[PDB]
Amino acid sequence: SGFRKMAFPSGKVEGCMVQVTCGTTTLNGLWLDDVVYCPRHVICTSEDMLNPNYEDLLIRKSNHNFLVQAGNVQLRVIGHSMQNCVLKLKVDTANPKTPKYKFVRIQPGQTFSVLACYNGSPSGVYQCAMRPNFTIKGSFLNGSCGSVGFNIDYDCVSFCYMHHMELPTGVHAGTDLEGNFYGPFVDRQTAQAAGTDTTITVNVLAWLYAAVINGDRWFLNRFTTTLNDFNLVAMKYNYEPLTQDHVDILGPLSAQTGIAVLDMCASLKELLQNGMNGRTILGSALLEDEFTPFDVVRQCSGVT
Amino acid sequence: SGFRKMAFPSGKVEGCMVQVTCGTTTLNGLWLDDVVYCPRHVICTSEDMLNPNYEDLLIRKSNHNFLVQAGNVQLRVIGHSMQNCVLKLKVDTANPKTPKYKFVRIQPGQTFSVLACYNGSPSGVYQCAMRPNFTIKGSFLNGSCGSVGFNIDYDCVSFCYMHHMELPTGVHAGTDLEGNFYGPFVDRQTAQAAGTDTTITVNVLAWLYAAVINGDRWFLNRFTTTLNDFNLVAMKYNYEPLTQDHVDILGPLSAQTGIAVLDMCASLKELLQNGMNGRTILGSALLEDEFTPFDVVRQCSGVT
Ligand SMILES: NC(=O)C1CCN(C(=O)Nc2ccccc2)CC1
Numbered sequence: 001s002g003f004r005k006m007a008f009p010s011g012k013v014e015g016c017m018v019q020v021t022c023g024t025t026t027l028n029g030l031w032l033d034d035v036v037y038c039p040r041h042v043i044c045t046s047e048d049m050l051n052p053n054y055e056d057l058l059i060r061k062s063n064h065n066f067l068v069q070a071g072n073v074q075l076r077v078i079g080h081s082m083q084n085c086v087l088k089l090k091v092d093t094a095n096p097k098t099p100k101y102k103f104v105r106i107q108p109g110q111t112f113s114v115l116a117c118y119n120g121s122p123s124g125v126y127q128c129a130m131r132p133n134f135t136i137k138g139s140f141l142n143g144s145c146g147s148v149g150f151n152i153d154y155d156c157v158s159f160c161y162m163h164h165m166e167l168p169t170g171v172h173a174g175t176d177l178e179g180n181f182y183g184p185f186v187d188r189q190t191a192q193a194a195g196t197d198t199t200i201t202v203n204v205l206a207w208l209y210a211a212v213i214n215g216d217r218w219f220l221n222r223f224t225t226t227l228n229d230f231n232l233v234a235m236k237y238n239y240e241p242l243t244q245d246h247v248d249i250l251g252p253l254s255a256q257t258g259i260a261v262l263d264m265c266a267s268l269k270e271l272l273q274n275g276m277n278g279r280t281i282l283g284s285a286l287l288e289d290e291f292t293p294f295d296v297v298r299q300c301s302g303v304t
Numbered sequence: 305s306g307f308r309k310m311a312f313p314s315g316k317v318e319g320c321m322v323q324v325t326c327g328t329t330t331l332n333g334l335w336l337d338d339v340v341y342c343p344r345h346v347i348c349t350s351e352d353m354l355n356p357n358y359e360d361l362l363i364r365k366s367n368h369n370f371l372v373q374a375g376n377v378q379l380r381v382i383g384h385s386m387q388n389c390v391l392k393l394k395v396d397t398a399n400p401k402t403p404k405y406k407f408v409r410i411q412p413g414q415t416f417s418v419l420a421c422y423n424g425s426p427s428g429v430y431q432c433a434m435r436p437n438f439t440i441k442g443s444f445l446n447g448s449c450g451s452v453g454f455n456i457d458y459d460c461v462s463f464c465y466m467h468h469m470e471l472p473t474g475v476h477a478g479t480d481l482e483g484n485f486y487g488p489f490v491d492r493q494t495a496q497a498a499g500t501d502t503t504i505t506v507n508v509l510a511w512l513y514a515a516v517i518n519g520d521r522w523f524l525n526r527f528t529t530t531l532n533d534f535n536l537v538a539m540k541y542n543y544e545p546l547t548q549d550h551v552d553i554l555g556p557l558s559a560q561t562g563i564a565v566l567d568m569c570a571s572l573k574e575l576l577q578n579g580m581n582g583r584t585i586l587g588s589a590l591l592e593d594e595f596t597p598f599d600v601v602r603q604c605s606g607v608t
């Protein structure tokens with residue numbers, strides 16, 4: 001029992017963090033096989049960052065201008081390429097701690113663990129969501145760039161995020177491991193405003209199931225609703241619309257708890273319209289939307 | 305920028321988790337040097353757990369009745385002793401992944417990362433507090449016992465918690481690594497009620513500093529207070545009393561932000577008396593008390 005915002009174990013990812021230095025800029029790299037991945041903006045001074053021409057900046061850079069350090073041993077760079085907004089640094093040594101891994105471009109609403117790093121050294125691990133506007137609400141100081149987001153399926157690490165930018169609003173943007181930004185974001189220090197930060201409706205409902213399973217039930221009511229009816233209330237509250245897919249995904253939690261999905265929707269409708277009245281659910285005074293249905297099944301079943 | 309409930313990297317601790325089986329009971333052990341540490345209640349059936357005589361139960365147990373497994377390799381048990389509420393299983397192999405480590409008995413209000421494990425396999429990592437009533441609010445299913453709480457200082461792991469019990473109320477109790485329960489708890493399945501769960505005042509104030517540093521300032525007011533005055537309001541709200549020590553510990557955050565500690569106390573007094581009025585602080589609708597002053601300095605400076 002109990003429910004907690006839980007990160008994946010960071011061990012397999014700790015073993016892949018290196019320091020990448022180009023001139024005066026140091027940040028984090030991901031060492032997998034004989035490739036170190038980092039944000040291409042390692043080649044920018046902060047001045048460059050106002051209007052960088054990455055192609056022009058890169059021309060001036062040779063393999064020997066990329067200083068790659070793993071703990072207290074230096075890696076030889078035998079190759080470098082720009083893929084989208086990441087650099088791939090070919091080193092002469094395969095990372096001996098390379099776990100099984102994939103690159104996956106996640107969907108908005110999906111959750112992942114972030115290993116916050118400085119100078120290739122991990123400082124902490126926290127669980128995140130990709131917001132519907134493709135921002136994340138991270139904890140990232142100067143030198144945190146190249147910190148990666150991941151999920152783990154038994155022994156395989158799916159890398160889904162590399163950290164690049166803090167937006168002027170203090171939220172975070174970055175790329176998949178192919179270097180493609182999540183959302184409309186660019187590795188340029190400019191006015192980039194994120195859109196509306198909507199709540200991940202399916203996640204909130206997942207977390208209401210987690211509550212019920214863990215004994216927090218006060219918010220169960222005698223009402224049901226329809227998807228159309230529920231989505232009228234969702235709209236008003238900047239909740240993501242709920243689809244039959246979302247309903248389908250909640251099926252197992254529905255089944256286990258014996259509370260139909262539309263009944264819980266009607267529970268959630270009342271919570272939105274009437275607030276918590278000073279009560280909490282799983283120790284929270286607002287509706288948590290950074291647990292997926294998969295997350296709740298995982299934590300309430302005990303998958304390793 | 306951004307502030308997050310961040311666990312220590314779990315890598316060094318992942319490398320020390322084993323499976324311990326005695327008859328039909330399997331749970332987690334901590335393999336450090338040539339000793340595996342586990343909850344002594346590995347020797348209880350759930351029936352025993354109603355009124356166990358650990359000395360009598362242990363007599364029936366030989367070294368060969370403790371099955372210790374590290375991934376898919378078995379460890380030979382050459383010795384076993386009962387220290388308080390833990391078993392120490394002497395194996396013939398030193399854990400080759402033993403990090404630098406200490407056992408430390410933490411103080412209430414202190415925070416630590418928990419690596420939730422099942423069958424010696426880590427499922428997730430989350431940050432915790434030792435509550436003032438010496439309970440923790442964990443996420444622990446059947447087979448999670450021997451899951452450990454820790455802090456990391458650069459490369460040294462201070463083990464501070466081993467998980468033993470879920471209380472009838474769904475909170476968690478367990479021991480330091482010397483086998484001494486935190487609080488009045490015993491490894492017996494009985495009515496054990498925890499005392500009042502007071503809020504960790506110094507932690508809340510630390511987290512208000514974190515808010516200010518991260519741009520959340522709406523709750524700063526024009527009032528100050530005294531320790532005595534503040535503690536009258538604390539009492540009423542089941543907040544731990546604030547001492548000159550607590551004030552001293554907040555000194556650096558005070559200094560950095562230029563907000564005196566007693567002014568922030570007066571900010572917190574108003575938050576207690578008037579609530580959040582539907583506003584949030586660092587994405588929370590209640591007062592967070594599971595960041596220590598050290599935690600806020602760490603995360604707002606970027607220590608690895
Ligand atoms: N800006 C540019 O035109 C270039 C593009 C290609 N390039 C490489 O280093 N390619 C390479 C070399 C050795 C092994 C593997 C790959 C440097 C940058």
Ligand SMILES: NC(=O)C1CCN(C(=O)Nc2ccccc2)CC1
Pocket residue numbers: 362363382383384385386394
């Ligand atoms: N219940 C009891 O009287 C005993 C107490 C001592 N004991 C041991 O196994 N001691 C031991 C043996 C070999 C190497 C290291 C330590 C078993 C339990």
